[PDB]
Amino acid sequence: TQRIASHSHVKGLGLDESGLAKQAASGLVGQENAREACGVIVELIKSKKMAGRAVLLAGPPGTGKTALALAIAQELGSKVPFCPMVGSEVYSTEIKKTEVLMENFRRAIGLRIKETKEVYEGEVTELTPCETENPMGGYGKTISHVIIGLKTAKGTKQLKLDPSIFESLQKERVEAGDVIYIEANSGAVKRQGRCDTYATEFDLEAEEYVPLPKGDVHKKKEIIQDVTLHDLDVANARPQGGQDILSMMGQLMKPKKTEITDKLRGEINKVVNKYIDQGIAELVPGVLFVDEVHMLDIECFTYLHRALESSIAPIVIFASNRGNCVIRGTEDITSPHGIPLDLLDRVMIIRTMLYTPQEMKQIIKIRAQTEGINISEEALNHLGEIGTKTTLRYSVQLLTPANLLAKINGKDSIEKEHVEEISELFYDAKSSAKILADQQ
Amino acid sequence: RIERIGAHSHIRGLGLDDALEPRQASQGMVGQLAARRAAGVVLEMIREGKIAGRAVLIAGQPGTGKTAIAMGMAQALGPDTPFTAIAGSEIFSLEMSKTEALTQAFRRSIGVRIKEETEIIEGEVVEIQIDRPSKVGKLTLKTTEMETIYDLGTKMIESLTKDKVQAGDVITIDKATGKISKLGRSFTRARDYDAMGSQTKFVQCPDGELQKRKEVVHTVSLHEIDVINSRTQGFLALFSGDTGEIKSEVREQINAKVAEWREEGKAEIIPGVLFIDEVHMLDIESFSFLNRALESDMAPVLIMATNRGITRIRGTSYQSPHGIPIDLLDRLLIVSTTPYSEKDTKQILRIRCEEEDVEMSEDAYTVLTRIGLETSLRYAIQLITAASLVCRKRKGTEVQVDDIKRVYSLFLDESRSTQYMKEYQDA
């Protein structure tokens, strides 16, 4: 279990097979038009065909922009990357604004890579070479194979390797009675330690007296690892390793870290294309969600032209809040949603509506249901009535403190008295604004 | 393999003839004849390459194919000539100055190519033998025409052992450096397969002479030489743009060395293109730098694009056309793109839905052209795919008028959005 947050109740866009909404499917109520619209863009994501497509969720605050923006994330499931960022995260000390944008852009493109690996392990009981006829003149002792016997908790089996493994085995310095690891395709021998059946009884040694392996001597499995392109980029930019004194940039943390196209494109898109066209990996192009996009700079908005016009881009959901508003970083240029007209020409706009009282009663009920509150129909109606006067979010937020008053007062559910009490302990924005307007 | 269709995937280059005559809708580009012909002229001068630092500004309305023309030039120019595309706002770094960023953008679009003949041994390993002692051994190699045998020195034995190569591998030896590179398994490289091992990675073995002489080209951008000479770390060239290159005896020193290589013929200089999109984002300091960066003999041609006309320049309160000072504007040839005719709009939509692999009815084309002529072309391009998804959700075969009308109702176009913004949200 985990703590309840603002959007813990939304579990999907709530769409039936024709792509409509009944009235309140999967934790969202109302907004049928907007939920249908981003129902289309969910399938735009699932088809994996388009790049850099962008949609702007535009409406008043509290009209579910964030809610259905991440209901999209619920519809897509955890398989595809859904990368959230707020419009204020772009301003950074270490790295240029547009570089944050590029990092986030290909942080939203996933790559899930499937690879079987197959392994042999066990306590090694036999280690005998196999002599053969002299390949050339009479030196004797021509080793053609080497027999190695491995024991696990399942059974004991003997195995023939070619002599190169005899050399590697000796160079790994394994002994009879310890536990090894052999990787069939690659050919490695790794000593994972003397077998615990030869127990540490008075040995204090730190080298692992490793328990006898469970399961078969031979075991294979398809490892399935999903990485974002940004993970590959970062791992190539500042790599690990105990050598190459540059790798001892280890006291230092990592400023200056704007990644380079030569690497980004020239060295890292080729390997992804290779793995994809080889049958090793699948691209999972995801979503980049930018809420409060109005906080971006004019330089950022203009960079998004180029970024959204790329073939190697996710689809981008923007959410905005402001009216016709001054673009940040400009000298008094006013434009809709605080976003330059130039970028608005590039986004399909989804309009979110302001709720009716009925819809607000439904949302209040769902939020009470989610936070674990029991609420009487009278208290629910009163929350609805005081929530028609002020914002939905305040109406919803009164639930938990009112429930605490109920619990203190010994009640099992919110009686109307408690919502009345809380609505006088705490104010909303509008009431407080009136107080401030009265007193100086 | 997976580089999804973006906004510009459909244009495979400028649809020009052998006489720089633009076709109406050939090679993915539609209409826009005059500006496309101008782009062809400057593309041919890019290819000829004998003039440095010439500058072109593609001006025009928002949406009238400026970026389409630029990427058409990029696609028609092809690889092996540097085309560096940059947004004007990319040069505002925290790690380096505006002018270092612009120098690096310029230099990243000049290539230096060193072309060298070298002799290799290419063959299928028939045997390798090697003794511990000053270890010593022999190697026998085959090509479809012949075989031969080599005695191996200690360093060669070491490098062969470092790759674990064996019979049946098909390999190259660079006679000058001795690095082995197994291209794969010859059909005689099959293991005994009495137990598990390496997979069946088979490939054909080589033909002709066992030892042969062939050409290798080492191409690096001027920024790339510059970076890797800057300081001994140098993997900077991949790490990040962490720079601030010292002008002192790196610009002049690289220029003199590359000019000497050009003159004595060791290297060929391949000047490319720097495309600055949304160049109006540059600072008056940036334009001031461009003035004299253009006036150089290691300067590529740079192309620029801008949507805006009479408006103040960034970093000051000076009005000017295109938002560029008439100082830099005097170094340029200006190519202005025109708005689209109804038939050009219809034909762009036709090509664009062909790229997106969606069928539409002619009435759907009619209404969508009407939409993209009343509102804006980009919106009509965005309705293609949305209507396609609406269509496929009803299991339709092709996009019909009702699909486009529905999805038009479903998404807004910044005109209807501003009209609906009559609610005073957070002004």
Binding site: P163 | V125, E127, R132, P133, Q166, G168, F187, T188, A190
Partner: peptide, 13 residues
Amino acid sequence: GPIITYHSVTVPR
């Protein structure tokens, strides 16, 4: 001393 020899050979391929 020890003259340990490694062969790898294209046998009947």
